[PDB]
Paper text:
Unlike traditional enzymes which are commonly referred to as highly specific biocatalysts, one special feature for hNEIL1 is its unique capability to recognize a wide range of substrates, including formamidopyrimidines, hydantoin lesions, oxidized, and dihydro-modified pyrimidine bases, derived from all four canonical bases. Here, by integrating structural, computational, and biochemical investigations, we show that hNEIL1 uses a triage mechanism to achieve broad specificity and reduce futile repair of normal bases. This mechanism involves two mutually competing interaction states: an activated state that commits catalysis and BER, and a quarantine state that temporarily separates and prevents the flipped base from catalysis via auto-inhibition.
This mechanism is further corroborated by our finding that the relative dominance of the competing interaction states can be manipulated by artificially introduced or naturally existing mutations to the key lesion recognition loop.
Author numbering: 2 to 202, 222 to 244, 250 to 290
Write the structure that this text describes.
Amino acid sequence: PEGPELHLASQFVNEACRALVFGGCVEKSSVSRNPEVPFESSAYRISASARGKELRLILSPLPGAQPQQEPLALVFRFGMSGSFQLVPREELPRHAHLRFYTAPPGPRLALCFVDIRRFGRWDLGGKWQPGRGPCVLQEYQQFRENVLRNLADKAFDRPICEALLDQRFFNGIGNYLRAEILYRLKIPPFEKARSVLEALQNPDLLELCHSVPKEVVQLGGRGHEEDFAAFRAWLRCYGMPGMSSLQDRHGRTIWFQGDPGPLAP
DNA sequence: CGTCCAGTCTAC
DNA sequence: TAGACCTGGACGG
């Protein structure tokens, strides 16, 4: 999951939970090393927002709910396999690590944070990760300014393909988006980042960091096989036949067409 | 059967 | 940095 998946997971939670009232506790699986959520309320609503590669749930007790409680915020990072599902309460998928249970009246559902590989994390504060830069989807101008004012940072000494994964400057960009973004401008992935960015100090690389991920959000879906076909068809570069690939300095595969670029392994 | 492949996080 | 953290599907023998 990259920026577009975190955003669509947000839209899912807001849409699927619009007319739902939750009750009881927040249940963690016994194998999750993430923290217990100390929250009980007889009647609460769940809402969400995304920022880059993080998602924030707000748990909002209704007027008079008991025990007395203030709203609680949780922030999620999805790692390699995180997702939200709404399922029947007795049809929990495998690897449902955190569960929110609908109160009656109506079909007993669970909203589940599902994470096969368990690289996903949640924190009890409502706070975004300190050090992550602005959202490329929802805070474009702040994102763009934060890169252009910090080109002296040693992060920009690196290949552009490596710099695009650094969540201090490109919060929301992951391995498929870096390939798609670089393929549209035919920028060699191992061109130095500072060269490509001082050059833009006909959409430029920073506009595409916003508009390419926006295109994925516009497809819709992502699971929550027919929209998996839509995604595969949208991809022009990542994993595609006739495309080159190399390992970057952290062993992550960059897909590209043509010239690997000057700092290539 | 086995190998290989798919975002942080933190000891060195 | 390198290895760690994890499960499962595709594919080879």
